[PDB]
């Protein structure tokens, strides 16, 4: 969390709950006699393709809205 | 239900090509039900869910990884 | 001929076979860390100090 905080200053809390849940799923299968190599390597490709697929699909260019973007961004924080 | 139904806009977003607006639909929570979040006005900076993303993984990774430990008592 | 040295002394073989015990004990607890398949340990200091 507080890696979080120097690096961008939001999403604190989020990462916390995503963390702590992306381990209780892990072991879910790791009890099921999948071997943790296995849930690491489907970890890291499934990061890798969440961030490519927000990049292409789920990005909002901020020139298309003015400074309204601003006042929303920030009132959302 | 609301994550049901806001998983359902979703599904139909990525299936069907002409429905590519459901993309923005989040969640109202002042009154319980789906919501177009882009014309809502509720934004976030990308750099905040894709550096979430990373750093929860990378952090879950360093734990999985872990199948023993040795607790050394203190020499006090 | 017969019956050779008696070796009356047993602390010998008890010290070699404790030296065994030992060293088979620290290779099995070692052993699930080798290979790609391989997980790492945690080991927390006297002092609280942790590494993985
Ligand atoms: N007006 C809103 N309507 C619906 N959801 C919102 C609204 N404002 C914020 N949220 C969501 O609520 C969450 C609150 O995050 P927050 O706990 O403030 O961030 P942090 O993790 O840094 O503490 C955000 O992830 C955001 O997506
Ligand atoms: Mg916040």
Redesign the interface.
Same mark, same amino acid.
């Given at each position: 969390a507080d890696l979080q905080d120097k690096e961008v200053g939001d999403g604190t809390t989020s990462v916390v709950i995503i963390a702590a849940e992306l381990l209780k799923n892990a072991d879910e299968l790791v009890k099921q006699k999948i071997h943790p190599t296995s849930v690491i390597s489907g970890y890291r490709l499934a990061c890798k393709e969440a961030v490519r697929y927000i990049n292409e699909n789920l990005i909002v260019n901020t020139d298309e809205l003015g400074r309204d973007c601003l006042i929303n961004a920030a009132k959302t924080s | 239900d609301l994550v049901a139904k806001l998983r359902a806009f979703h599904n139909e977003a990525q299936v069907n090509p002409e429905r590519k607006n459901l993309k923005w639909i989040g969640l109202d929570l002042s009154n319980g039900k789906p919501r177009d979040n882009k014309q809502a006005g509720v934004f976030e900076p990308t750099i905040v869910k894709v550096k979430s993303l990373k750093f929860a993984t990378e952090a879950a990774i360093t734990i999985l990884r872990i199948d023993d430990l040795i607790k050394l008592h203190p020499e006090s | 001929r017969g019956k050779g040295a008696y070796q009356d002394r047993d602390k010998p073989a008890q010290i070699r076979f404790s030296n065994i015990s030992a060293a088979k004990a620290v290779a099995d607890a070692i052993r699930?860390?080798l290979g790609? %398949?391989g #997980? @790492? %340990? #945690?080991?927390? @200091?006297? %002092?609280?100090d942790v590494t993985?």
């Open positions: - | - | 699930t860390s790609p %398949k #997980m @790492d %340990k #945690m080991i927390q @200091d006297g %002092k609280g993985i």
